[model samples]
Target: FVEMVDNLRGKSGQGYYVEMTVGSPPQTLNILVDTGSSNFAVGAAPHPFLHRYYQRQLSSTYRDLRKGVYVPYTQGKWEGELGTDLVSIPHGPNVTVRANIAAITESDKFFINGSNWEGILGLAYAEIARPDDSLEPFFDSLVKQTHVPNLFSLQLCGALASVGGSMIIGGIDHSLYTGSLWYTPIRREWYYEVIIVRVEINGQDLKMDCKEYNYDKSIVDSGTTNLRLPKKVFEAAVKSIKAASSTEKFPDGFWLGEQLVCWTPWNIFPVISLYLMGEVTNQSFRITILPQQYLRPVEDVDCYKFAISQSSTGTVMGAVIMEGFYVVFDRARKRIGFAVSACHVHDEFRTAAVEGPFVTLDMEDCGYN
Candidate 1:
């Protein structure tokens, strides 16, 4: 398996970078590992900064596709040209995969000055890729041409700790997680989308109506730091937390110049459960979000803040909720699996494989109706 280490930054464990080589002679570059979108491109000419970028003149296998690429996001946009080159992962098999890469000609102030990483490597499907929709992603090309499997797993470390987790491409490390994996079928191939049947807080159902707000769809994105739920759902969650707590709501602008603070102990907070649809059966699987996973302690006070927020569109299950689970993206079967991460084992690092004859979820064993 190709192992990629996490480069955690800032007070909140948000940014994650992985090292990658993109050239004939192997020019090493640090890329942001993102699962929300798919398009491999590095910063190039015109964008001023000493950060390393893909130099087309340095590679012998470089082919200028002459196609313009325009990738826009909520934060900013990346405008570049579509170029083909030999990209390789540093260690392991050391094999190179020829794929299309974006060479950024211009970028917004957010990407040029606000971000530390030089480029972005999208891990999602090719349907959402820019400039060319038919182009296969870097990981997909590796799986098709090399001996790698069509699966990948992520073990992200907590916000307080550093250098504890790894991203295993082409396989799953069983030692990173305990117990059987609960599998959920992908509703859409574009963004690793899944079905969220229901959400429960403190034994009270939110009574979510899928038709009203499109709450059925939820995307598992490692790129996002906070959980972005629907507007109604966000209001309900905040009201439920307030009702469960004995202390008064934290005043606005309390700690770190931020809002949404709570005075209650995090352990006594209510448990939030997300019910996801299964692959074969009509039943749904449960993923419980503990208080520790959602609440972050304020700098000096006994107050804590919820890691979740509201989104204009559909729900996004971000890193805050994902850090507590070992997630697997199975492209071959169009499914995603989740299990409790082995974060409690603080002494040694664990490893497991999912490529060769891996275990599958049985309907009988799942205890579903």
Candidate 2:
């Protein structure tokens, strides 16, 4: 019943995508999974880049609503026509929800060359829905129609054994994690908003005003590619990683992500801390992001693309951080849960490392719009 803004990568190994059964007899199209936006838009028009699209004319349940919605991303954008159809997620709830879908007619670099997704499935609220919120959001219509609980969870197990990832439509899957979830209250209804009371650089706190961590709107996004921070925090983070190589002056832009410092010269990486609001009052928890999460190896240069960057919008906890944790968007209780993701690699160990529930700050409302 609304529109949304999604990230660039919906490709094979980035975000998760599941089979969506749209239309009457239903068309099986794979759609990218996201958490920040609310609408469920699908590729309806023909495009050489798209492997599949929802052919609305083929379905008896399709009803063109004669309305339009548009979404712009950091690297891509699309405009669509509003339409109503009975929808179903083959991996989601069993029943079909008569839902609204934005039929994508034209787009930009949204359909990446090697990616295999036709659209996006946003799992957020209706407040920021484009066009209007009067039309119910995807998940809202989901929980309303089904007998399932008003909550869902996600595990972005990036390329973990060719297992793209999973989205639990109604509850948490205990098998995806090893420990109890660390809970954080959703400060606002906009974007799974939460308070980040701390930002630690290689085990030491950046020590800035905690609010600076969320300069604009901090949300744990499912599709954004990297860990984004406010300019101030990002600068401090860059400065810290730079200081580690005191003897080696790798040039200025190297740390700014301009030059690719090959593995031989700069192989070591840093561990940063992602702090979230805890269960009780004045309580907060810490999730340690290991080097494996922030360091991305570049194919052409034999170097690591610093996966952490400065956000013009806000501190976005995206794929870099989410890959290390199993996230639960518990709308029922208005909180988000975090646990070490059930992940392993060929080099021979688990990628996710988590810890927390420490009483770090006695502050409140540390989040911005």
Candidate 3:
């Protein structure tokens, strides 16, 4: 199994970086782990000092595809040329996987200056790949080549803490989570998409008028830092939080415009729950996020801000909500599973088979497990 520890960068744990070795001599580089898009490219010149782009001439095994590639994001775009090289995990098990990569020719200033990671390592499917090239992602290549199992799991650390979580590429680590995992079918193979039956805040359901807005589908995106909902849904959630917590004050100059700054403790904030339909049994399974998971404390005051809102198109279940759970991406079965993280538990390592039978609804109930 290929395993790597996550390094939380920046003050607010803005991004998760993983270490990987590229090229013949294996030049170690820290790459930004993304699940929203499928485009793996290194940065060009004029990038951050801590992390820089891959130099094609430096790698002995680098092969040029001679094709230009362009990938667009909510904030900026990545423009580069297609290339291939030997990509390996850092330090143990010398298994080299020849995968397609992008040598970024140009990138937005925000990506170059703001981020510490050298480049992006997309975990999504090839359907969302850019430049009309159906290039398989690194993980997919690893599975297809029989180098590893067709599964990957994520255990993200909390925003306030750093250097504690891990990413298991080839298998699942049973010790990372408690109880049986709840599974949901992938609505679309492109973006780790799933069906959302209902959304509730403080035990009250926020009914979505289907004709007016699309709320049935949601994407589990590790690349995104915060949860993004539709306009109406976001407003309703904010209203629910205000009603439950008795605070009407909204903070300004935050990352998102709709963040609420409450003087009260984080535990007082309302809990948000998402009910999702099961892929096989069609049963409803729920995922809950505590107040502390969605709120972060401000530096000086006792103030805490709601860290999630509608910042982009549709609904995106991001890292803020995901950090509370152990997430598994089962590519072979086309399903995603979730279990409450066991990070608090101190014990010896326990490993499980990567391709075990699916955990049924009878094994574990919805919410918290």
Candidate 4:
């Protein structure tokens, strides 16, 4: 069955969510779909930033586990209590499970003004689960109860603006993509870790060691906003992009993402590309990102921001890249697949493109695992 998703709400490039039924009376709330962590956290306490919350007190079926829970993100963190309640999806597959959920009591930098999503649904494995590793995430519970297929796929057609899409649980939608799916073996269960062959722009390699691309462990995380690179890899990427023309001047703040710039002069040049481990051994599949997607325009002022950012841990292929491809999290076989989306199969701008089973070596040891 398919679960439809709304586009990236708030922050221009964050929080793609879906409506879910929680509590015994089945109160509906928008839960942000995040793949970076493993917790279904929602606002249990009142706050100005949240327009809606899970109103834990109102649910008759709710049972407080009295366990403390917390989640940490690149920019924010939250602490809460653990509880279990009836959970089901309105737009998703026909399955219901009394799932473990976090009732957030307090947070820092997690909830912000101008955001609409009140909670986060972490989709990764449970190795990184908070409070303890014994927690079985919502999806695991769903599989155990209903015996659904072990894999799920996502197709996001929007990026930060009027975002909407679908999440297919237990299987893949053959119609969402145009070609055969290219699979990449998951190096580790936590965080959807995968091997990154390298990053390139217009066929020019970034000239870094393959290990640098996997500085910590390359991951495909939909919850994150940008295509985050390791510190050294990001610095090298900046240098390579600037190498296009040193004479051309862009404010230092622009590169640092501190300020927006009128991008009339820069018409999305330097198309970026990412190479991931292909199904074939020592082979790679190339996913191309047209400048149109990475060059994010804001406010119709011709103002834009570069969607790539620096990562302290490792590479995170975020929404900026995911929105371009139909990503499949094949937990059943420990592999992730990417295919060109059918939604944009005929879009005018056509943001994401894919090709190649090019030969690539040194990918076997690219990850920390």
Clashes of 2: 0
lDDT of 4 by residue, 125-170 (tens): 9898887668888888888888788888888765435666778878
Identify the leading candidate in terms of TM-score: 4
For model 3, residues 250-332, the per-residue Cα lDDT tens digits are 54444354443544444455667776656556356677777666775544345565577774367788876677788898988
Question: Which runs of model 3 end up more than 4 angstroms from their true locations?
Answer: 1-13, 44-50, 91-94, 109-114, 160-163, 209-216, 247-264, 297-303, 344-369
Which runs of model 1 end up more than 4 angstroms from their true locations?
1-13, 46-50, 91-93, 109-115, 160-164, 210-216, 252-264, 296-305, 344-369
The ten-residue window of minimal lDDT in model 1 covers 349-358
| Cα lDDT listed for each candidate | 0.68, 0.76, 0.67, 0.79
Worst 10 contiguous positions by lDDT, candidate 3: 345-354
lDDT of 1 by residue, 223-266 (tens): 77777787777777777766775464455433222665643344
- Report the Cα RMSD per candidate: 6.1, 4.5, 6.2, 2.6
- Where does candidate 4 have its weakest 10-residue lDDT segment? 2-11
Candidate 2 lDDT tens digits, 166-242: 67778877777767789888988878888889877677778788778888868989868788888998998888877
lDDT of 1 at 253: 39
Error of 2 at 208 (Å): 0.4
Clashing residue pairs in all predictions, respectively, total: 2, 0, 0, 3
Question: How many times do residue backbones clash in model 3?
Answer: 0
Off by over 4 Å in 4: 1-11, 72-76, 245-248, 263-268, 344-351
